[PDB]
Amino acid sequence: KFLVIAGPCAIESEELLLKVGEEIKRLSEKFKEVEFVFKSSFDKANRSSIHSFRGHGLEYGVKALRKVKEEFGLKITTDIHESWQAEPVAEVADIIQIPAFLCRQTDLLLAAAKTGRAVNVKKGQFLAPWDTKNVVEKLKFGGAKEIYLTERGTTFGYNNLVVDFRSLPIMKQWAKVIYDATHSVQREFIFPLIRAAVAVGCDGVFMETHPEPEKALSDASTQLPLSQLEGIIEAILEIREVASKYYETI
Amino acid sequence: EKFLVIAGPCAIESEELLLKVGEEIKRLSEKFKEVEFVFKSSFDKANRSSIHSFRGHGLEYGVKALRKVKEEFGLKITTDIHESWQAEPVAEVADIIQIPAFLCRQTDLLLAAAKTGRAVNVKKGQFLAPWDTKNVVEKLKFGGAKEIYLTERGTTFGYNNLVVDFRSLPIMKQWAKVIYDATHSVQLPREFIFPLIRAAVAVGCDGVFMETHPEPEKALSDASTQLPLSQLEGIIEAILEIREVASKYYETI
Amino acid sequence: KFLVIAGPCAIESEELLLKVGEEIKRLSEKFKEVEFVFKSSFDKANRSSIHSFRGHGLEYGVKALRKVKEEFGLKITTDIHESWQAEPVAEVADIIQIPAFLCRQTDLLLAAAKTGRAVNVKKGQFLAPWDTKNVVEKLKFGGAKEIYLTERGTTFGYNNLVVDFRSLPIMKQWAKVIYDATHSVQREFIFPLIRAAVAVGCDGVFMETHPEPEKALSDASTQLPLSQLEGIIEAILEIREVASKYYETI
Amino acid sequence: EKFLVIAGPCAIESEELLLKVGEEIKRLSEKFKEVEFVFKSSFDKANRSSIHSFRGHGLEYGVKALRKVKEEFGLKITTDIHESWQAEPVAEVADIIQIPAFLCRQTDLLLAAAKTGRAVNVKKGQFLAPWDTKNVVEKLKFGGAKEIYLTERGTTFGYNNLVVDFRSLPIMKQWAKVIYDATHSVQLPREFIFPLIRAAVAVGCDGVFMETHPEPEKALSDASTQLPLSQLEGIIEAILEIREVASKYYETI
C-alpha cells in the first residue's frame, strides 16, 4: 500500500508526540489503504548554528517514541547520526532513517542494515539519481531487505533546492521511492509538489507536521499544520488512483 | 477554463508533413471538445548549434504552409519569430506569436509581436528565474498584448542538462497563463516526457506544448524529443484525466 | 599583445565617451604592451524592465563612437542585436560584439561575419564551454577570420552567475579568449577574478569603466571606476608576465 | 604569512607508500623554507561510492604509519575523522584534524575535533554556500578550536560535476584561514588541476591541499586526480611565484 511517513520534525516532548500520534492514528483508521509510519528526530545533529535546539537526547527520544507505538500501535521511524546509535534505535524504530548529508557514510549504512530493520536513505543534495544504486548495494551487502530512497531535492545554486522529478523513475529501478514534501522546498509549494510526486509515481510521501508550525523548535517555516494533513492525504490518494494507470513499468 | 494543447511538428519540413499532422490534430480536436488546440510549427530553426543543421524553407513558404493548415482544417496557428520584422508577416496567419527562449529578453522582438494584436507566448529562457518573468509580461502589456502566455521549458542545471523547477508554474501564474513544454524540458542542450507532463498537470498549468512527428526518427530537428504522432491521443487523454482529479486542489492565485 | 577592451557600458552621451576615451588613450600610450579597444553600447536591447534606459539610438551612437576613433585613434567595438545592424555598425566598429543571449542566433553571427570585421561572441550563460566550437565554425563559414569568445559566467541557480575557469583553456582550442571582468560577477569580486583569469591564461580582458559608476545609467553596481583602471591593468600585466611561463600549450 | 602546503597520498595504502612520499615532502620542505608543509593521508575512506572500493587498513595501523612519518621526517601531520570517537586517538599524532566535506555540518564531529586542542580544517561541503561557513567557524570556536581552516573543494554544479566559485576565497577569509583543494575540486562525483591552482593563488588563499602519489595510475583511491609526486616540486615553485607577484594586490579583509 501507499506509505505516508509523518510526525513533528523534532521530539520537542513526548507530549507533542502524543498529540500528533493521536491524529496520525485517526487517519490510520480512516485510510486503511495507507501504511502510516510515525516520524520524529531525537536529535537535530546537523543544525547550521551551535545556538539552536537539538533535542532532549537519544534516551528521552527513544522513550517518547516507544510511548507512541505502545499507545497507538503505529510503526516508528527516526534518524541516526553515528554507527553506535543504530542498535539502541532499532529497539523501537521499524524504519531507520539515514540523513541526507550522511547517505555515503558506509559504516552508518552498514550499522543500520545490521539491525535487521528497514532502512530509508535520504538522497544527498549532492547526489545524482543514478548514483543511489551504489547506496542500495551497500545496504543489501549489509543485510538490509526493506530499502527506501527518499527524494528531498538537489543543490541548485546557493541556498536553494530543486526537485528533479526524473529522479523518481530512475531510483525506482533499485528501491522503493519516497518523496519528502517538506524538506524539498526548504510552504506554498508543499502541496503542488506532492501532487506532482504522485502524478509521476512514488511508493510513499514523507511530511513533517506540527500542531502549530510557527511555534515549532525546528522547520517552523516548512512543517505542515496538523489540521491540513487529512486533506492532503485524501488528495494524493485520489490523484494516485487515476495516475497509477500510467506509471511506467519498472 | 478550456485547457490548451499546442502541438505540431518542430519544423516545417514540408507542407505535406504539416497537413498529415494537422489531420490528426483536427481529429483529436473533434474528440476532445473540452480542449483548445493550436497547431505549431517553425518556419525557421534560427538557433541550431551547428551551421550544418536543417533550418527550414523560408518564412514565405512556411507562412503559406501554415495558412493551408488553418484553411484546410480550421485550426488556430502559432509559430515563432526571430527578428522584429517577422512579426508583421507572421501575424497574418499566426493566432499566437511565439518568442524563442534565448530571445525572451529582446525588447524590440517582444514589442514587435505585441503590436500585431495577436496573442504572444514567451518561452522562459533557461537562464531566467520564475519571478523575473513578471517584467517580461509588463513589456508585452506595455506593447499592447492582451493575451499573454509564459512557457516553462526547463532551466540550466550544470552543463548540457535542464531541470524543471515546478515551483515556476504557480509563480508565473501570478501574471500570465502558463504553458508546460513537455518535449523541450527533457532535451539535453524521451522516457521522461510523459512522467514530467503528468507532474505539470497535477501541479496545475493552463496548457501543454508538445512537438509531434509521424516518425520522429526521421525528423530534421529534435529527432530525439518529438513525440510520435500515434501517441498524442493517449497522452492528451491522460493529462485531461489527471487534470480533472487534481483540479479541485489547484491553489488560487 | 594582450587585449584590453574597456569603456562605459552605454553611450550616455558622446561627451561621456570622450572623457573615458581620453583616459584609455593615456593608458594606451603608457602600456604599448597592450592593444586597447574602446567599447560602448548604442542600445541596451535586453533590459529586464521596459522602463529602463536603453540609449540614444544607433545613429547617435555610431556618430559618438566615430568621434572617439577620430579624436584618439582607438579601435572600436560595440554590440549588435539584429542582423540589419551589422553593416552600419561595421563602418566604425573594428570588433563587432555579439550579446550573450544571442550567441546562437545564426543570422546575427553570419551578418557580423559578412562585414569582414573581427567578431567577439559573449558566451551565453546557458552554453557549455565545448559547445562554443560550433559558434566559431558558424563564424568561419560566414567569412570571419578574427574570432573571440568571451567568458562572462554561467547560470548557477537563480540570479547568480559562477565563473568556471576551466572554460578558458577549453575555448582556447578554437578561438582567442577574453575574460569579461564586470558582467561575470553581476564589485568586490571584480579584481580577484580578473587576477584569476590572467593566472589561468587568456588573450584579453573586458571591463566596463565609468567616471562615476553610481551615476551611470547602466551597470551602476558593476562598472569599474575610471581611476582604478590603470592599477588593475598594471597588476594583470605583472601577473601575466610571471604566470605565462606556465600557460598550457593549446 | 608562511604559505601552507598540505600534501600526501590520498589513502594510507601502506606505511611504505607514506615514507616514500614523506621523503620527498621533507626534501621540498628544506628547499621551500618559506612554506609550512603538512603531510596528509587518510586511514579510512569512509565514504566511497562503492562497497567494493578500497577503504584502508584501520585507524590503529594508519595512526602508527603517520606517527612514523612525523618521527622519521619531522613533518606536521593531518588526517580526517569520520565519527566523534576518532578525534581523541587521532589527536595523538595529527597536528590538524580534517573534517570531511559531507560531514561539515555534523555538530558532534566538529565539537570532538575542537576539544582536542589541535587545529581543525573543515572541507566546505559541496552543498554549502560560502557565507554559510561562518556558522561552521562559530561551532568550532564554541568547541575550543583556536586554529581553524576552511577548505574550498568545489560546489555541486548539475550532476556529476563540481565548479569552483573563486568568490568563496575572499568570503571565507572573513572568518578563517582558507585552503584550496587542488585535486578534489576537479573531480567528477587532471588537465585542470594546474590552471585552477594558479587561479587560487592569484585570487589569494592561505594554503593549498594536494593529493600526490608516486604512481597515480596505481592508486587505490582517486587514481584519476592524484598528482604524480615528481610534479609536486614544479607546481609548488609555480604557485609561490604567482603568489609573490599577485600578493601586493590581495585585498584586506
Chain A residues close to D159, C-beta within 8 Å:
128-129
Backbone angle region of C130, left / alpha / beta, with phi > 0 → left and psi within -120 to 50 → alpha: alpha
Q: Measured between CB atoms, does B162 come within 8 Å of chain A?
A: no
Q: Report the C-alpha gap between D242 and D35 in whole angstroms.
A: 14
CA atoms within 13 A on the CB side of B162: 26
Provide the sign of the torsion angle of the four alpha carbons D102, D105, D106, D109, taken in this order: positive
Residue of A40, A51, A42 lying closest to A18 (CA atoms): A40
> Which grid cell sits at C96?
563587432
* CB-nearest partner of C101 from B105, B138, B142: B105
Could you tell me which chains touch chain A, where touching means 3 or more CB pairs under 8 A? B, C, D
A82 touches chain D (CB under 8 A): yes
Q: What is the dihedral of CA B74, B80, B84, B89, to 10 degrees?
A: -20
Chain B residues with beta carbon closer than 8 angstroms to that of C127: 189
CB contact under 8 A, D106 and A141: no
First-last CA distance in chain C? 17
Tell me which residue in C156, C168, C195 faces D202 most closely, judged by beta carbons. C195
Rounded to whole angstroms, the Cα distance separating B143 from B247 reads: 33
B227 backbone dihedrals φ, ψ, rounded to 5°: -80, 135
Residue D27 host element (H or E): helix D15-31
CB contact under 8 A, D199 and C201: no
Task: Residue C158: list chain A partners with CB under 8 A.
Answer: 156-157, 160
Q: What would the grid cell of residue B45 be?
A: 530553426
CA angle C42, C46, C48 (to 5 degrees): 130
CB D77 within 8 A of CB D104: no
Alpha carbons C23 and B8: distance in angstroms, whole number? 56
Q: Torsion-angle region of residue A176: left (phi > 0), alpha (psi -120 to 50) or beta?
A: beta
CB atoms within 10 A of CB D233: 14
Q: Give C128's DSSP letter.
A: -
The 3-state DSSP class for residue A96 equals strand
**Nearest chain D Cα to B158, which residue?**
D158
Option in B50, B83, B156 nearest C83 (CB): B83
Which residues of chain D lie closer than 8 angstroms to A41, CB-CB? none
Min Cα distance B151 → chain A (Å) is: 18
Return the number of CB contacts < 8 Å for A and B: 90
Candidates D221, D177, D181, D161; CA nearest to D100 is D181
Dist CA A245 CA B192 (whole Å): 16
Per-residue CA distances from C97 to B234, C37, C42 (Å): 48, 12, 12
Single-letter residue type at B89: P
Chains that touch B (3 or more CB pairs under 8 A): A, C, D
Look at chain C and report how many structural domains it folds into: 1
Among candidates B47, B135, B160 on the partner chain, residue whose Cβ is nearest the Cβ of C48:
B135
Q: Which residue of A lies nearest to B171 if distances are taken between CA atoms?
A: A189
For residue B107, the domain's CATH number is 3.20.20.70
Per-residue burial over C103-140, b = 16 or more CB atoms within 10 Å of its CB, e = otherwise = bbbbbbbbbbbebebbbbbbbbbbbbbebbbbbbbbbe
What is the rounded distance in angstroms from the CA atom of residue A4 to the CA atom of residue A208? 11
Q: How far apart are CA C108 and CA B88, in angstroms?
A: 20
D-chain residues near C195 (CB < 8 A): 202-204, 246, 249
Helix axes A229-243, A190-200, angle to 10 degrees: 30
Cβ-contact D148, D120 below 8 angstroms: yes
CA atoms within 13 A of residue D223's CA, in its CB half-sphere: 8
Backbone φ and ψ for A230, nearest 5 degrees, come out as -55, -50
C156 CB near a chain D CB, below 8 Å?
A: yes
Q: What letters, b where the CB count within 10 A reaches 16 and e where it falls short, cover B44-53?
A: bbbbbbebee
**Backbone phi and psi for residue C238, each to the nearest 5 degrees, phi listed first:** -65, -45
Buried b / exposed e across C12-21, counting CB within 10 Å, b at 16+? bebebbeebb
Q: What are phi and psi of B80, to 5 degrees?
A: -100, 145
What is the rounded CA–CA span in Å between residue A26 and residue A73?
12
Contacts of B129 (CB under 8 A, 6+ apart): C158, C159
Strands (E), D44-171: 76-80, 96-99, 119-123, 148-152, 155-156, 162-163
How far apart CA C141 and CA C149 sit, in angstroms, is 16
Which residues lie across from B208 on neighbouring strands? B5, B180
Instruction: Pick the closest to residue C236 from D164, D248, D1 (CA basis).
Output: D248
SS3 C229: helix
C-beta of residue C80 within 8 angstroms of C-beta of residue C102: no
Rounded to whole angstroms, the Cα distance separating B202 from B182 reads 14
Contact: C106, B47; criterion CB under 8 Å: yes
Task: Tell me the C-alpha distance between C218 and C195, whole Å.
Answer: 25
- The secondary element (H helix, E strand) that includes residue C239 is helix C229-243
Backbone angles phi, psi at B237, to 5 degrees: -60, -45
Which chain B residues in 4-63 lie under 8 Å from chain C, judged by CB atoms?
A: 46-51, 55
| Chain D: residue whose CA lies nearest to A84 | D83
Count other Cβ atoms within 10 Å, centred on residue B39.
24
User: Do D202 and C243 lie within an 8 Å CB cutoff?
Assistant: yes
C-beta neighbour count of D252 within 10 angstroms: 4
| Residue at D11: amino acid letter | A
**Chains touching D, CB cut-off 8 Å, 3+ pairs:** A, B, C
Q: Residue A239's closest CA among A188, A189, A205?
A: A205
Side-chain-facing half-sphere of D195: CA atoms under 13 Å: 21
> Domain residues for D142?
1-253
Beta bridge partners of D120: D97, D148
**A103 secondary structure, DSSP code:** T
From chain B, the residues in CB contact with A248 under 8 A are: 191, 194-195
Q: Give the gap in angstroms from C-alpha D189 to the nearest C-alpha of chain A.
A: 8
Q: List, in sequence order, the alpha helices (H) in A73-132.
A: 86-89, 106-114
* Element housing A77 (H / E): strand A75-79
Residue listed under C-alpha cell 609550512: D36
What are A162's three cell numbers? 530543486
Please indicate whether, in this complex, the C-beta atoms of A192 and B199 are within 8 angstroms of each other: no
- How distant is the Cα of C36 from the closest Cα of chain D, in angstroms? 23
- Chain A residues near residue B244 by CB distance under 8 angstroms: 242
Contacts 24+ apart (CB under 8 A), D52-57: D53/D221, D54/D11, D54/D13, D54/D220, D54/D221, D55/A106, D56/D11, D56/D12, D57/D12, D57/D14
Cell of C134: 560550433
Q: List the grid coordinates of B124.
A: 522562459
Tell me whether residues A160 and C158 touch, CB distance under 8 A: yes
Beta strand segments in chain D, E: 3-8, 35-40, 76-80, 96-99, 119-123, 148-152, 155-156, 162-163, 177-181, 207-213, 227-228
Separation in Å, CA of C153 to nearest CA in chain D? 10
Which residue is closest to D243 within chain C, CA to CA? C239
Partners of D158 on chain B (C-beta within 8 Å) are 157-159, 161
| B103 part of contact set with chain C, CB < 8 Å | yes
Q: How far is C104 from chain B (nearest CA, A)?
A: 5
D169's grid cell: 576565497
User: Under a CB-based contact definition with an 8 Å cutoff, are residues C240 and C204 in contact?
Assistant: no
A160 and chain D: CB distance < 8 Å anywhere?
no
**Contact status, residue A34 vs residue A237, Cβ threshold 8 Å:** yes
CB of C106 less than 8 A from some CB of B? yes
Q: Name all contacts of D191-196 with Cβ < 8 Å and 24+ positions apart.
A: D191/C169, D191/C248, D192/C166, D192/C169, D193/D225, D193/D227, D194/C246, D194/C248, D194/D235, D194/D238, D195/C165, D195/C166, D195/C168, D195/C169, D195/C200, D195/C201, D195/C248, D196/C165, D196/C166, D196/C200, D196/D164
Q: Does A188 touch chain B (CB under 8 A)?
A: yes
Q: C127 phi and psi, to 5 degrees?
A: -90, 140
Helix (H, G, I), strand (E, B) or coil at C48: coil
Are residues D159 and B159, on separate chains, in Cβ contact within 8 Å?
no
CA–CA distance, D154 with D104 (Å, rounded to integer): 14
User: What's the gap in Å between the CA of A143 and the closest CA on chain D?
Assistant: 13
Pick the residue from chain C with its C-alpha nearest to A160.
Answer: C157
| Nine cell digits for residue B195 | 512522467
Number of other CB atoms surrounding residue C238 within 10 Å: 15
Question: Measuring CA to CA, which residue among B146, B156, B150 is closest to residue B123?
Answer: B150
Q: D252 Cβ partners below 8 Å, 6+ apart? A: none
Contact D163 C156 (CB under 8 A): yes
Resolution of the model in angstroms: 1.8
Contact between A96 and A114 under an 8 Å Cβ cutoff? The reply is: no
Q: Do B157 and A164 touch (CB under 8 A)?
A: yes
Among D185, D203, D250, D253, the residue to mutate for chain C (most C Cβ within 10 A):
D203
Does B142 contact C at CB distance below 8 Å?
A: yes
What is the number of CB-based contacts under 8 A between chain A and chain D? 87
Q: Which of B206, B198, B203 is nearest to B249 (CA)?
A: B203
Cβ atoms of A223 and A182 within 8 Å: the answer is yes
> Is the separation of the CB atoms in B145 and B129 below 8 Å?
no
To the nearest whole Å, the CA of D135 is away from the closest chain C CA by 22
Report CA-CA distances (Å) from D175 to B18, D5, D150, D168, D200: 63, 20, 9, 12, 18
Contacts of C155 in chain B (CB under 8 A): 126-127, 155-156
CB spacing of B157 vs D161 below 8 angstroms: no
Q: Is the dihedral of CA A114, A115, A117, A118 positive or negative?
A: negative
- DSSP helix, strand, coil percent of chain B (3-state; round to 5): 40, 20, 40
Residue C141 with chain B: CB contacts under 8 Å: 51
Q: Say if the Cβ atoms of C200 and D201 lie within 8 Å.
A: no
Range list of H helices, chain B: 15-31, 59-73, 87-91, 107-114, 134-142, 168-172, 193-203, 232-247
Question: Which of B215, B182, B202 minimizes the C-alpha distance to B249?
Answer: B202
**What count of other Cβ atoms lies within 10 Å of the Cβ of residue B15?**
16
Sign of CA dihedral D204, D209, D215, D221: negative
Q: 3-class DSSP state for residue A125? A: coil
Cβ A50–D135 below 8 Å, yes or no? yes
